[model samples]
Target: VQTDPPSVPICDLYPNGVFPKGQECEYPPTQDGRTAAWRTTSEEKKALDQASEEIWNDFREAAEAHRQVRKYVMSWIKPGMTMIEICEKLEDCSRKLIKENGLNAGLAFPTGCSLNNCAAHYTPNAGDTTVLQYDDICKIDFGTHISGRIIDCAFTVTFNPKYDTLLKAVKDATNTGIKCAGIDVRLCDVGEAIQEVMESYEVEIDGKTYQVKPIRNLNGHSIGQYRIHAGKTVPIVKGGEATRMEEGEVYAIETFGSTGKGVVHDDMECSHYMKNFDVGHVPIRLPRTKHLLNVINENFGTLAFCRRWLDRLGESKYLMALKNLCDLGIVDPYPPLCDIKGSYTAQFEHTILLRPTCKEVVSRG
Candidate 1:
């Protein structure tokens, strides 16, 4: 079973309050009360203890499923399959496995995708019909959740033998990144180690220099009854918001290396998920349109909304409205986009828990 956090004051999971600012706010007692229930379960502390083993077991099972899907997808790697095809295959595999195991899950499959020389979150768009070529080096990041605990991991593969050296460089660098994630280690130390590891290889792809870019916008976060970016940012390079690693805290340490310029870009495209709006049409609103509001409420639990969905909203009037709400700090977006093409990037990540004696790699293969 996962160990509980050492005695610390419980913080509001959604401190800014749910439902955005000033849009119609629905006060369903179940949603509001349960949201509070999740934050401070001190009253039902016994229930938390009883549920710990099951939750940990589900996390382990999800990790195994992640590894299996990774292995299967890598086996299907071929010269003709596009990143879009790869994403579809991986999604299919993930859904099938989750069903077979009777586990609740979701996937953030980013393949055949690059961003600003760092590769992560490159899921093929539905219209992306590009074919994979021999020279392509792509990253695939995915995750599964059983109950509320999550297992997120990623790997990069090369189609041609020529890219093998780059692959090796990334593999070695990733291990270094993982090793730096021990308890009491500063998050920036992991980034520093990653930078050192990548530069030591001195590898270049497509005539571009290889460097490690600690994806400043994305970092390992705390996960519990909900997916909390937790406002904790772990750098893969030696700069940015630095934080101390504490025992019992779970994080997904990711390392990214690039073969081009070090800057990353944000996702500008928008996509909508749910279509219903007939529920409580309250005005505790954010910058989202009715479509986005419905989608966020339906897909995400009462805690928060997915950043990807906001990214999908693009420059539409709806997104513009949503942005205003975000300005009020009522809603937080997920990691912004960081993808570019022709620059081969690699990523390796695992969910880890810091302990007094050691840090546990919760997402073990």
Candidate 2:
């Protein structure tokens, strides 16, 4: 079945904060005949006792923005698009759909477009000319926030038929994790379930068959108001502390499948950074650092940002200042996480809210 473009704008998808029914925003099925994409069910449209109606409305609005943007992006994104171009387009569309205004609504973090063996936390720097190729498996991960209620969702794209198994593995694993997650459910049990489903598949590339492995280091995390990575962590592998998911919590149930070593190491030039909110007063010495900090506070606050955003804001020669901020423990830098060369990785993610009655997959659409 052909997925149709959205008949209404994102802002209109939810009328007076009510989710519309029977919308035509379904994503096309993958080439492998697996329906990896999912739509929001009607049961999730009602408000629960976990929060006020207005709060639920904000969360739904952000999720709808993400769904609309992903649908539009999936229609046109293809090989040969530069990494910079992809990031800009995603961010620009999200900003437009969310009506980004003064820390109330906008991108929750930097647009992460990790390719191939790179698992996550990768975005292009200014002037970086890396282009997406037909053979490359690209992971598009991004989020939108309305009043700090962020909708974190992601999907992997590959034109080559050889990598279909890899995408299916990750997508199925993510759904498995989401299914196992619920109020008072043990996080380790969810992780075990996810790993089992993810590791069951194998992919053949260039006549060599390799079993898919879950990227061990990267774990799904709980989200909070204006904070992307909250305190609790949802692991992808078994054998962690048996922390239970609680009610009135939001989480990103993401899973990664790889054809190489399961572990991912930090590599490549860093493009993502966020100001350290836990640190106390640290006297910054450099004038440039102070100026840059002011700009960051005024613009991004604690949201993750990238070099491309700095360049877009007309800042020049500020890398040294950014470095100084990191050195002083005022900012945290996140480099790209990559597996072994010659291996391919895929990722799928969705955000869920554990309401009083049931868990809602907020980013399903």
Candidate 3:
């Protein structure tokens, strides 16, 4: 059954200056033939707690691996290399690190776009080819999952010296954005500060205007064990779903600046799914559908599998498992969109932890 979006305004998803009541926004009910709930008992919770710590430890390691990969690729970037070569080399670097370090890495999930301007959801298809020119901007965004926890981050790079000023503006704006992610502060306050920084420059770079769309549908999200897109909303601009921040929360503060129209529209290339599921004790088996029973069992604590590999299976299978998980409140998949045609975008992000006294940037290199 199709579900309506939550009634709570996106800004109200997280209330500033007040403690969250833990009343999670409700998702749609379970579809027929899916699990009811993928919850754990008290004893199970204890085990999961231990596993969660282990998972976080792996997350830290993966973060370091990603840092190394980025640095290595950045060092090799030059004017002579084609964009395709740059993307291939970057992906190779990430994949090599994952193989050597026993971590999961992806060059591009949706494939087909180059670095400087890709948002999420656009990965390189098998045979599509594109070359990078000297004037292009590339955004390299990716995530690595350790155990169950995940770390998602991105950075933008430019080959043209003329665009360096715009690059610096975005970098400074991102740094300002991170500093604004404080405890008990209103979410809009962060957006306001970001806008001030971006607009303050108000200069053209590379013969294009640097405008900030400050994506409305996508914002900084709360993340923790078993909850990647946690219920908190962090806005990039001073409108819609803007709220105050709270302590003991982690967020991936992201900001975007573009060289075209500030408005971005979604392309119909990505799909969304429900992630809650209820697996009964009596193994409810089904006729071989697209979903994988093995992966389901692995998620139930058999052979441990990383989320990246689990997501690579065909969509039908992915949707089947995702439906079961959503029915049981195990996972929630957010919708995705491709970048607008003929426009270049740049994004900067960091995962931060809010504390009683200060905020922590967890995704630091």
* Highest TM-score against the true fold, candidate: 2
Residue runs of model 3 more than 4 Å from their true location after superposition: 1-59, 77-118, 205-213, 271-288, 291-340, 355-357
Q: Local distance difference test, per candidate?
A: 0.53, 0.82, 0.52
lDDT score, residue 112, model 1?
28
Candidate 2 per-residue lDDT, tens place, 76-140, comes to: 88999999888888887788778788788888888999999899999999889999999999899
Error of 1 at 121 (Å): 2.3
At residue 69, give the lDDT of candidate 1: 71
TM match of model 2 to true structure: 0.89
Which digits, one per residue and each the tens of the lDDT, describe model 1 over residues 37-75? 232235453354344545555566566556667777777
- Clash count list over all predictions: 26, 0, 29
- List TM-scores for all candidates, in order: 0.67, 0.89, 0.64
lDDT of 3 at 55: 42
By TM-score: ranked, best first: 2, 1, 3
For candidate 3, give the lDDT of residue 249. 66
lDDT tens digits by residue: candidate 3, 235-353: 66667455667645667777776555555555533333323333333343554322455454434222122233444444244545555554544444433343566655667776665
Any idea what lDDT model 1 has?
Answer: 0.53
